[PDB]
PDB file of C-alpha atoms in Angstrom:
ATOM      1  CA  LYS A   1     -10.133  21.749  14.915  1.00  0.00           C
ATOM      2  CA  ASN A   2     -10.974  18.414  13.173  1.00  0.00           C
ATOM      3  CA  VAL A   3     -11.541  18.797   9.409  1.00  0.00           C
ATOM      4  CA  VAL A   4     -13.317  16.059   7.413  1.00  0.00           C
ATOM      5  CA  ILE A   5     -11.703  15.535   4.003  1.00  0.00           C
ATOM      6  CA  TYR A   6     -13.167  13.420   1.208  1.00  0.00           C
ATOM      7  CA  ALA A   7     -11.225  11.956  -1.718  1.00  0.00           C
ATOM      8  CA  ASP A   8     -12.719   9.568  -4.228  1.00  0.00           C
ATOM      9  CA  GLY A   9     -11.269   7.487  -7.017  1.00  0.00           C
ATOM     10  CA  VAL A  10     -11.010   4.064  -8.575  1.00  0.00           C
ATOM     11  CA  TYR A  11      -7.805   3.102  -6.741  1.00  0.00           C
ATOM     12  CA  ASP A  12      -7.187   0.269  -9.190  1.00  0.00           C
ATOM     13  CA  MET A  13      -3.849  -1.528  -8.714  1.00  0.00           C
ATOM     14  CA  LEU A  14      -2.949   0.910  -5.932  1.00  0.00           C
ATOM     15  CA  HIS A  15       0.532   2.387  -6.340  1.00  0.00           C
ATOM     16  CA  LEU A  16       2.815   5.004  -4.831  1.00  0.00           C
ATOM     17  CA  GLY A  17       1.017   7.678  -6.838  1.00  0.00           C
ATOM     18  CA  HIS A  18      -2.308   7.031  -5.118  1.00  0.00           C
ATOM     19  CA  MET A  19      -0.619   6.826  -1.730  1.00  0.00           C
ATOM     20  CA  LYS A  20       1.175  10.145  -2.164  1.00  0.00           C
ATOM     21  CA  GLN A  21      -2.155  11.717  -3.160  1.00  0.00           C
ATOM     22  CA  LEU A  22      -3.922  10.260  -0.132  1.00  0.00           C
ATOM     23  CA  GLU A  23      -1.098  11.499   2.096  1.00  0.00           C
ATOM     24  CA  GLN A  24      -1.592  14.985   0.694  1.00  0.00           C
ATOM     25  CA  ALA A  25      -5.316  14.932   1.274  1.00  0.00           C
ATOM     26  CA  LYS A  26      -4.688  13.679   4.816  1.00  0.00           C
ATOM     27  CA  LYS A  27      -2.215  16.458   5.664  1.00  0.00           C
ATOM     28  CA  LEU A  28      -4.137  19.374   4.190  1.00  0.00           C
ATOM     29  CA  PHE A  29      -4.734  20.424   7.816  1.00  0.00           C
ATOM     30  CA  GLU A  30      -3.285  19.750  11.245  1.00  0.00           C
ATOM     31  CA  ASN A  31      -6.159  17.513  12.391  1.00  0.00           C
ATOM     32  CA  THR A  32      -8.183  15.661   9.753  1.00  0.00           C
ATOM     33  CA  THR A  33     -10.409  12.689   9.163  1.00  0.00           C
ATOM     34  CA  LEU A  34      -9.740  11.421   5.634  1.00  0.00           C
ATOM     35  CA  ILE A  35     -12.687   9.584   4.019  1.00  0.00           C
ATOM     36  CA  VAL A  36     -11.838   7.727   0.804  1.00  0.00           C
ATOM     37  CA  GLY A  37     -14.545   6.895  -1.721  1.00  0.00           C
ATOM     38  CA  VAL A  38     -14.072   3.855  -3.967  1.00  0.00           C
ATOM     39  CA  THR A  39     -16.059   3.809  -7.204  1.00  0.00           C
ATOM     40  CA  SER A  40     -18.221   0.816  -8.113  1.00  0.00           C
ATOM     41  CA  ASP A  41     -17.080  -1.614 -10.795  1.00  0.00           C
ATOM     42  CA  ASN A  42     -20.113  -1.051 -12.979  1.00  0.00           C
ATOM     43  CA  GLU A  43     -20.064   2.744 -12.975  1.00  0.00           C
ATOM     44  CA  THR A  44     -16.282   2.783 -13.371  1.00  0.00           C
ATOM     45  CA  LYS A  45     -16.517   0.481 -16.383  1.00  0.00           C
ATOM     46  CA  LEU A  46     -19.325   2.445 -18.024  1.00  0.00           C
ATOM     47  CA  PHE A  47     -17.979   5.992 -17.657  1.00  0.00           C
ATOM     48  CA  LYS A  48     -14.190   5.662 -17.262  1.00  0.00           C
ATOM     49  CA  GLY A  49     -12.792   2.368 -18.489  1.00  0.00           C
ATOM     50  CA  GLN A  50     -11.609  -1.100 -17.646  1.00  0.00           C
ATOM     51  CA  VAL A  51     -10.851  -1.876 -14.000  1.00  0.00           C
ATOM     52  CA  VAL A  52      -8.521  -4.723 -13.068  1.00  0.00           C
ATOM     53  CA  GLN A  53      -9.587  -5.350  -9.473  1.00  0.00           C
ATOM     54  CA  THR A  54     -13.084  -5.665  -8.065  1.00  0.00           C
ATOM     55  CA  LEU A  55     -14.612  -3.384  -5.474  1.00  0.00           C
ATOM     56  CA  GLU A  56     -13.758  -5.754  -2.626  1.00  0.00           C
ATOM     57  CA  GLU A  57     -10.103  -6.057  -3.647  1.00  0.00           C
ATOM     58  CA  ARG A  58      -9.698  -2.338  -4.277  1.00  0.00           C
ATOM     59  CA  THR A  59     -11.162  -1.556  -0.883  1.00  0.00           C
ATOM     60  CA  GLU A  60      -9.238  -4.270   0.965  1.00  0.00           C
ATOM     61  CA  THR A  61      -5.980  -2.672  -0.213  1.00  0.00           C
ATOM     62  CA  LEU A  62      -6.966   0.865   0.812  1.00  0.00           C
ATOM     63  CA  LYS A  63      -7.670  -0.380   4.313  1.00  0.00           C
ATOM     64  CA  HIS A  64      -3.907  -0.932   4.711  1.00  0.00           C
ATOM     65  CA  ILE A  65      -2.876   2.650   3.878  1.00  0.00           C
ATOM     66  CA  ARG A  66      -2.083   4.676   6.954  1.00  0.00           C
ATOM     67  CA  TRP A  67      -3.560   7.970   5.811  1.00  0.00           C
ATOM     68  CA  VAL A  68      -7.041   6.486   5.318  1.00  0.00           C
ATOM     69  CA  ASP A  69      -9.458   7.016   8.193  1.00  0.00           C
ATOM     70  CA  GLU A  70     -12.769   5.909   6.648  1.00  0.00           C
ATOM     71  CA  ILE A  71     -13.846   4.239   3.420  1.00  0.00           C
ATOM     72  CA  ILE A  72     -17.132   4.649   1.585  1.00  0.00           C
ATOM     73  CA  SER A  73     -17.374   1.552  -0.595  1.00  0.00           C
ATOM     74  CA  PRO A  74     -18.951   1.776  -3.056  1.00  0.00           C
ATOM     75  CA  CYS A  75     -19.155   5.547  -3.268  1.00  0.00           C
ATOM     76  CA  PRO A  76     -21.387   7.666  -5.510  1.00  0.00           C
ATOM     77  CA  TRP A  77     -19.913   8.387  -8.909  1.00  0.00           C
ATOM     78  CA  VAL A  78     -20.968  12.066  -8.892  1.00  0.00           C
ATOM     79  CA  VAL A  79     -20.471  14.134  -5.718  1.00  0.00           C
ATOM     80  CA  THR A  80     -23.534  16.096  -4.602  1.00  0.00           C
ATOM     81  CA  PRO A  81     -24.241  18.759  -1.956  1.00  0.00           C
ATOM     82  CA  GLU A  82     -26.512  16.355  -0.079  1.00  0.00           C
ATOM     83  CA  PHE A  83     -23.630  13.857   0.041  1.00  0.00           C
ATOM     84  CA  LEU A  84     -21.372  16.483   1.674  1.00  0.00           C
ATOM     85  CA  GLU A  85     -23.993  17.205   4.331  1.00  0.00           C
ATOM     86  CA  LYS A  86     -24.752  13.530   4.943  1.00  0.00           C
ATOM     87  CA  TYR A  87     -21.115  12.771   5.786  1.00  0.00           C
ATOM     88  CA  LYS A  88     -20.258  16.178   7.323  1.00  0.00           C
ATOM     89  CA  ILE A  89     -17.546  16.760   4.727  1.00  0.00           C
ATOM     90  CA  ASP A  90     -15.594  20.000   4.935  1.00  0.00           C
ATOM     91  CA  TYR A  91     -13.480  19.587   1.786  1.00  0.00           C
ATOM     92  CA  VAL A  92     -13.167  17.433  -1.317  1.00  0.00           C
ATOM     93  CA  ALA A  93      -9.653  16.526  -2.494  1.00  0.00           C
ATOM     94  CA  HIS A  94      -9.027  15.718  -6.165  1.00  0.00           C
ATOM     95  CA  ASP A  95      -6.286  16.512  -8.614  1.00  0.00           C
ATOM     96  CA  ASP A  96      -7.965  18.886 -11.193  1.00  0.00           C
ATOM     97  CA  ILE A  97     -17.368  19.760 -12.852  1.00  0.00           C
ATOM     98  CA  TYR A  98     -15.838  20.939  -9.583  1.00  0.00           C
ATOM     99  CA  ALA A  99     -17.024  24.534 -10.178  1.00  0.00           C
ATOM    100  CA  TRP A 100     -19.588  24.357  -7.392  1.00  0.00           C
ATOM    101  CA  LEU A 101     -17.066  22.971  -4.898  1.00  0.00           C
ATOM    102  CA  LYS A 102     -14.645  25.787  -5.668  1.00  0.00           C
ATOM    103  CA  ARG A 103     -17.460  28.317  -5.469  1.00  0.00           C
ATOM    104  CA  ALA A 104     -18.299  27.000  -2.020  1.00  0.00           C
ATOM    105  CA  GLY A 105     -14.734  27.055  -0.665  1.00  0.00           C
ATOM    106  CA  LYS A 106     -14.826  23.247  -0.441  1.00  0.00           C
ATOM    107  CA  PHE A 107     -12.298  22.186  -3.115  1.00  0.00           C
ATOM    108  CA  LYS A 108      -8.675  21.383  -2.281  1.00  0.00           C
ATOM    109  CA  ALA A 109      -6.384  20.256  -5.084  1.00  0.00           C
ATOM    110  CA  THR A 110      -3.903  17.379  -4.793  1.00  0.00           C
ATOM    111  CA  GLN A 111      -1.260  16.339  -7.336  1.00  0.00           C
ATOM    112  CA  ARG A 112      -0.529  13.107  -9.133  1.00  0.00           C
ATOM    113  CA  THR A 113       2.984  11.725  -9.473  1.00  0.00           C
ATOM    114  CA  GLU A 114       3.920  10.442 -12.902  1.00  0.00           C
ATOM    115  CA  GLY A 115       5.981   7.384 -13.773  1.00  0.00           C
ATOM    116  CA  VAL A 116       5.330   5.442 -10.549  1.00  0.00           C
ATOM    117  CA  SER A 117       2.312   3.429 -11.681  1.00  0.00           C
ATOM    118  CA  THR A 118       2.007  -0.338 -11.651  1.00  0.00           C
ATOM    119  CA  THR A 119       1.757  -0.500 -15.435  1.00  0.00           C
ATOM    120  CA  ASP A 120       5.056   1.413 -15.501  1.00  0.00           C
ATOM    121  CA  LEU A 121       6.582  -1.385 -13.406  1.00  0.00           C
ATOM    122  CA  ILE A 122       5.829  -4.111 -15.941  1.00  0.00           C
ATOM    123  CA  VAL A 123       7.290  -1.930 -18.676  1.00  0.00           C
ATOM    124  CA  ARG A 124      10.425  -1.963 -16.540  1.00  0.00           C
ATOM    125  CA  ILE A 125      10.285  -5.747 -16.115  1.00  0.00           C
ATOM    126  CA  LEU A 126       9.945  -6.044 -19.877  1.00  0.00           C
ATOM    127  CA  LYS A 127      12.805  -3.725 -20.826  1.00  0.00           C
ATOM    128  CA  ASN A 128      15.119  -6.541 -19.492  1.00  0.00           C
ATOM    129  CA  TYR A 129      14.758  -8.060 -22.990  1.00  0.00           C
ATOM    130  CA  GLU A 130      16.591  -6.715 -26.005  1.00  0.00           C
ATOM    131  CA  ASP A 131      14.236  -6.577 -28.964  1.00  0.00           C
ATOM    132  CA  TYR A 132      16.830  -8.922 -30.542  1.00  0.00           C
TER     133      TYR A 132
ATOM    134  CA  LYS B   1       3.585  -4.102  27.721  1.00  0.00           C
ATOM    135  CA  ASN B   2       5.196  -2.841  24.453  1.00  0.00           C
ATOM    136  CA  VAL B   3       6.667  -5.661  22.328  1.00  0.00           C
ATOM    137  CA  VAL B   4       9.177  -4.903  19.543  1.00  0.00           C
ATOM    138  CA  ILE B   5       8.559  -7.063  16.467  1.00  0.00           C
ATOM    139  CA  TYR B   6      10.910  -7.335  13.495  1.00  0.00           C
ATOM    140  CA  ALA B   7       9.951  -8.524  10.010  1.00  0.00           C
ATOM    141  CA  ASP B   8      12.286  -8.400   7.049  1.00  0.00           C
ATOM    142  CA  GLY B   9      11.831  -9.002   3.355  1.00  0.00           C
ATOM    143  CA  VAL B  10      12.347  -7.668  -0.133  1.00  0.00           C
ATOM    144  CA  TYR B  11       8.900  -6.052  -0.387  1.00  0.00           C
ATOM    145  CA  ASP B  12       9.236  -5.794  -4.159  1.00  0.00           C
ATOM    146  CA  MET B  13       6.100  -4.538  -5.941  1.00  0.00           C
ATOM    147  CA  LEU B  14       4.260  -4.445  -2.609  1.00  0.00           C
ATOM    148  CA  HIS B  15       0.864  -6.152  -2.755  1.00  0.00           C
ATOM    149  CA  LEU B  16      -1.995  -7.215  -0.512  1.00  0.00           C
ATOM    150  CA  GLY B  17      -0.037 -10.321   0.450  1.00  0.00           C
ATOM    151  CA  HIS B  18       2.785  -8.315   2.015  1.00  0.00           C
ATOM    152  CA  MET B  19       0.313  -6.002   3.722  1.00  0.00           C
ATOM    153  CA  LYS B  20      -1.651  -8.860   5.269  1.00  0.00           C
ATOM    154  CA  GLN B  21       1.636 -10.317   6.541  1.00  0.00           C
ATOM    155  CA  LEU B  22       2.710  -6.992   8.027  1.00  0.00           C
ATOM    156  CA  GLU B  23      -0.708  -6.633   9.661  1.00  0.00           C
ATOM    157  CA  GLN B  24      -0.243 -10.038  11.258  1.00  0.00           C
ATOM    158  CA  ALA B  25       3.190  -9.203  12.569  1.00  0.00           C
ATOM    159  CA  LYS B  26       1.810  -5.922  13.927  1.00  0.00           C
ATOM    160  CA  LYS B  27      -1.079  -7.579  15.787  1.00  0.00           C
ATOM    161  CA  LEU B  28       0.836 -10.476  17.308  1.00  0.00           C
ATOM    162  CA  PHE B  29       0.365  -8.650  20.633  1.00  0.00           C
ATOM    163  CA  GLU B  30      -1.836  -5.947  22.103  1.00  0.00           C
ATOM    164  CA  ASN B  31       0.868  -3.252  22.065  1.00  0.00           C
ATOM    165  CA  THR B  32       3.687  -3.543  19.524  1.00  0.00           C
ATOM    166  CA  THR B  33       6.293  -1.595  17.640  1.00  0.00           C
ATOM    167  CA  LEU B  34       6.693  -3.207  14.212  1.00  0.00           C
ATOM    168  CA  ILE B  35      10.134  -2.702  12.608  1.00  0.00           C
ATOM    169  CA  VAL B  36      10.342  -3.695   8.937  1.00  0.00           C
ATOM    170  CA  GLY B  37      13.680  -4.563   7.356  1.00  0.00           C
ATOM    171  CA  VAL B  38      14.126  -4.001   3.615  1.00  0.00           C
ATOM    172  CA  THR B  39      16.871  -5.999   1.912  1.00  0.00           C
ATOM    173  CA  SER B  40      19.500  -4.264  -0.218  1.00  0.00           C
ATOM    174  CA  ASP B  41      19.352  -4.510  -4.002  1.00  0.00           C
ATOM    175  CA  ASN B  42      22.767  -6.102  -4.304  1.00  0.00           C
ATOM    176  CA  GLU B  43      22.316  -8.811  -1.684  1.00  0.00           C
ATOM    177  CA  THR B  44      18.780  -9.516  -2.896  1.00  0.00           C
ATOM    178  CA  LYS B  45      20.025  -9.936  -6.460  1.00  0.00           C
ATOM    179  CA  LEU B  46      22.935 -12.175  -5.483  1.00  0.00           C
ATOM    180  CA  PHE B  47      21.170 -14.593  -3.125  1.00  0.00           C
ATOM    181  CA  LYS B  48      17.464 -14.487  -4.061  1.00  0.00           C
ATOM    182  CA  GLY B  49      16.788 -13.136  -7.529  1.00  0.00           C
ATOM    183  CA  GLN B  50      15.804 -10.205  -9.668  1.00  0.00           C
ATOM    184  CA  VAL B  51      14.221  -7.206  -7.944  1.00  0.00           C
ATOM    185  CA  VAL B  52      12.046  -4.778  -9.887  1.00  0.00           C
ATOM    186  CA  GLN B  53      12.213  -1.727  -7.625  1.00  0.00           C
ATOM    187  CA  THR B  54      15.243  -0.154  -5.996  1.00  0.00           C
ATOM    188  CA  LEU B  55      15.802   0.176  -2.277  1.00  0.00           C
ATOM    189  CA  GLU B  56      14.502   3.748  -2.219  1.00  0.00           C
ATOM    190  CA  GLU B  57      11.286   2.869  -4.056  1.00  0.00           C
ATOM    191  CA  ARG B  58      10.663  -0.264  -2.008  1.00  0.00           C
ATOM    192  CA  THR B  59      11.114   1.685   1.196  1.00  0.00           C
ATOM    193  CA  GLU B  60       9.080   4.697   0.067  1.00  0.00           C
ATOM    194  CA  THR B  61       6.083   2.394  -0.458  1.00  0.00           C
ATOM    195  CA  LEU B  62       6.390   0.687   2.937  1.00  0.00           C
ATOM    196  CA  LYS B  63       6.299   4.075   4.614  1.00  0.00           C
ATOM    197  CA  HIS B  64       2.641   4.345   3.533  1.00  0.00           C
ATOM    198  CA  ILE B  65       1.484   1.103   5.188  1.00  0.00           C
ATOM    199  CA  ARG B  66      -0.284   1.704   8.460  1.00  0.00           C
ATOM    200  CA  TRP B  67       1.078  -1.280  10.352  1.00  0.00           C
ATOM    201  CA  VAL B  68       4.706  -0.193   9.886  1.00  0.00           C
ATOM    202  CA  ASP B  69       6.232   1.678  12.812  1.00  0.00           C
ATOM    203  CA  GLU B  70       9.927   1.750  11.855  1.00  0.00           C
ATOM    204  CA  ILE B  71      11.970   0.819   8.800  1.00  0.00           C
ATOM    205  CA  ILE B  72      15.554  -0.396   8.692  1.00  0.00           C
ATOM    206  CA  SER B  73      16.676   0.329   5.140  1.00  0.00           C
ATOM    207  CA  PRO B  74      18.799  -1.368   4.042  1.00  0.00           C
ATOM    208  CA  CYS B  75      18.649  -4.183   6.565  1.00  0.00           C
ATOM    209  CA  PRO B  76      21.143  -7.010   7.095  1.00  0.00           C
ATOM    210  CA  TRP B  77      20.524 -10.036   4.926  1.00  0.00           C
ATOM    211  CA  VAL B  78      21.143 -12.535   7.757  1.00  0.00           C
ATOM    212  CA  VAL B  79      19.629 -11.865  11.201  1.00  0.00           C
ATOM    213  CA  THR B  80      22.075 -12.165  14.099  1.00  0.00           C
ATOM    214  CA  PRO B  81      21.791 -12.156  17.908  1.00  0.00           C
ATOM    215  CA  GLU B  82      23.746  -8.900  18.092  1.00  0.00           C
ATOM    216  CA  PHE B  83      21.213  -7.341  15.701  1.00  0.00           C
ATOM    217  CA  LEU B  84      18.345  -8.324  18.040  1.00  0.00           C
ATOM    218  CA  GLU B  85      20.103  -6.719  21.004  1.00  0.00           C
ATOM    219  CA  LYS B  86      21.066  -3.593  19.066  1.00  0.00           C
ATOM    220  CA  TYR B  87      17.436  -2.854  18.173  1.00  0.00           C
ATOM    221  CA  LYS B  88      15.855  -4.311  21.349  1.00  0.00           C
ATOM    222  CA  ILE B  89      13.855  -6.813  19.306  1.00  0.00           C
ATOM    223  CA  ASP B  90      11.583  -9.187  21.189  1.00  0.00           C
ATOM    224  CA  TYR B  91      10.405 -11.299  18.237  1.00  0.00           C
ATOM    225  CA  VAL B  92      11.131 -11.946  14.574  1.00  0.00           C
ATOM    226  CA  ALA B  93       8.155 -12.488  12.249  1.00  0.00           C
ATOM    227  CA  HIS B  94       8.583 -14.521   9.055  1.00  0.00           C
ATOM    228  CA  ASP B  95       6.496 -17.076   7.251  1.00  0.00           C
ATOM    229  CA  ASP B  96       8.518 -20.378   7.589  1.00  0.00           C
ATOM    230  CA  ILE B  97      17.884 -21.150   9.493  1.00  0.00           C
ATOM    231  CA  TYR B  98      15.449 -19.889  12.119  1.00  0.00           C
ATOM    232  CA  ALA B  99      16.358 -22.739  14.514  1.00  0.00           C
ATOM    233  CA  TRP B 100      18.123 -20.410  16.928  1.00  0.00           C
ATOM    234  CA  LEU B 101      15.208 -17.962  17.000  1.00  0.00           C
ATOM    235  CA  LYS B 102      12.781 -20.762  17.810  1.00  0.00           C
ATOM    236  CA  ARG B 103      15.164 -22.129  20.420  1.00  0.00           C
ATOM    237  CA  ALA B 104      15.224 -18.711  22.047  1.00  0.00           C
ATOM    238  CA  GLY B 105      11.445 -18.191  22.082  1.00  0.00           C
ATOM    239  CA  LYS B 106      11.881 -15.310  19.619  1.00  0.00           C
ATOM    240  CA  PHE B 107      10.253 -16.674  16.433  1.00  0.00           C
ATOM    241  CA  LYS B 108       6.645 -15.909  15.506  1.00  0.00           C
ATOM    242  CA  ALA B 109       5.284 -17.291  12.249  1.00  0.00           C
ATOM    243  CA  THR B 110       3.132 -15.301   9.813  1.00  0.00           C
ATOM    244  CA  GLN B 111       1.358 -16.602   6.701  1.00  0.00           C
ATOM    245  CA  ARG B 112       1.461 -15.619   3.062  1.00  0.00           C
ATOM    246  CA  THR B 113      -1.679 -15.243   0.973  1.00  0.00           C
ATOM    247  CA  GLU B 114      -1.560 -16.804  -2.467  1.00  0.00           C
ATOM    248  CA  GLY B 115      -2.990 -15.445  -5.702  1.00  0.00           C
ATOM    249  CA  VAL B 116      -2.987 -11.757  -4.708  1.00  0.00           C
ATOM    250  CA  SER B 117       0.417 -10.784  -6.089  1.00  0.00           C
ATOM    251  CA  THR B 118       1.102  -8.044  -8.600  1.00  0.00           C
ATOM    252  CA  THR B 119       2.333 -10.523 -11.198  1.00  0.00           C
ATOM    253  CA  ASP B 120      -1.023 -12.285 -10.765  1.00  0.00           C
ATOM    254  CA  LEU B 121      -2.729  -8.999 -11.684  1.00  0.00           C
ATOM    255  CA  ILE B 122      -1.065  -8.732 -15.088  1.00  0.00           C
ATOM    256  CA  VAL B 123      -1.997 -12.337 -15.795  1.00  0.00           C
ATOM    257  CA  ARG B 124      -5.553 -11.168 -15.184  1.00  0.00           C
ATOM    258  CA  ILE B 125      -5.125  -8.159 -17.483  1.00  0.00           C
ATOM    259  CA  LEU B 126      -3.800 -10.517 -20.136  1.00  0.00           C
ATOM    260  CA  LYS B 127      -6.551 -13.133 -19.904  1.00  0.00           C
ATOM    261  CA  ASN B 128      -8.816 -10.447 -21.551  1.00  0.00           C
ATOM    262  CA  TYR B 129      -7.409 -11.748 -24.868  1.00  0.00           C
ATOM    263  CA  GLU B 130      -8.537 -14.990 -26.438  1.00  0.00           C
ATOM    264  CA  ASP B 131      -5.529 -16.889 -27.731  1.00  0.00           C
ATOM    265  CA  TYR B 132      -7.367 -16.585 -31.086  1.00  0.00           C
TER     266      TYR B 132
END
C-alpha cells in the first residue's frame, strides 16, 4: 500500500525542527514515498520574507535527510489540484488556505518543535557573555 | 561484502560539511555499515574547545542523516585497537596520531568542505548591514 506524501517549505538553515517534521510526514503510513517541495528564492522573498540560503544550498541539504524520498526544486508556491494529479500525491503534510485539501481527505497535519532552530543556537552562543 | 566504517567527531551545529563527509565515509565501498561516534561534552570541552549543543542534541540530529547506520554516543575520545575489535570495524574515516591505523591498512581519508559551516551562515546574515 504505497502512499505518496507531499510536504513543502522553505527549509532555510535546516534544523532539528524541520527534520522532525519531515520524519512525521514520512511515517504517516506504513509504506510511503515522501516528496519535499522547496520554495524558490524569489517567491519566498516576495511573499514570506528573507531567506539565508539559495535554492541550490537549501536543496543540497535536504538531499542528506533520510526521510526524504524525492525533491521538487523549485516547487510551486501555491498547491493546486492539477499539481496533486501530476505527481500522484495522496496527501499533503503541513503544520496548520488548506480548506480544499481537508475537504478532499488529502490534508495531514504535522507539528513544529519550538526552541530548536538555528537562530536559537546563536542566541545560546551569545548568552556566554555577561552584559557587563 | 559488507564493510564496517567508523567515523567520529563532535558534530556540533551539524552542517552540509559534516553531511558531505559522512556521505563519503558511507560510500567508500559498495556495501557498508557506517558507525558514527559522537564525542562527549566534557572531553570535547577539555581537549578541543567550546561545544554549542549537548550530547543528546548532537546525537538527535545525526539520527536524521541518511548515511548514518549506527551511532556510538558518547564515543571514546581516542580510538584504540580494542575498540576496533569490539565493534568489528574494518576502517576508520577521518579527514587528516593515525599512524597505527595507516600502518594496519585501516585508515581511509575523507575531505572537509570549506565555507558551508553554520557560523558562515550568520556571517552572511550579518553582511546585510552596511557598517554605516
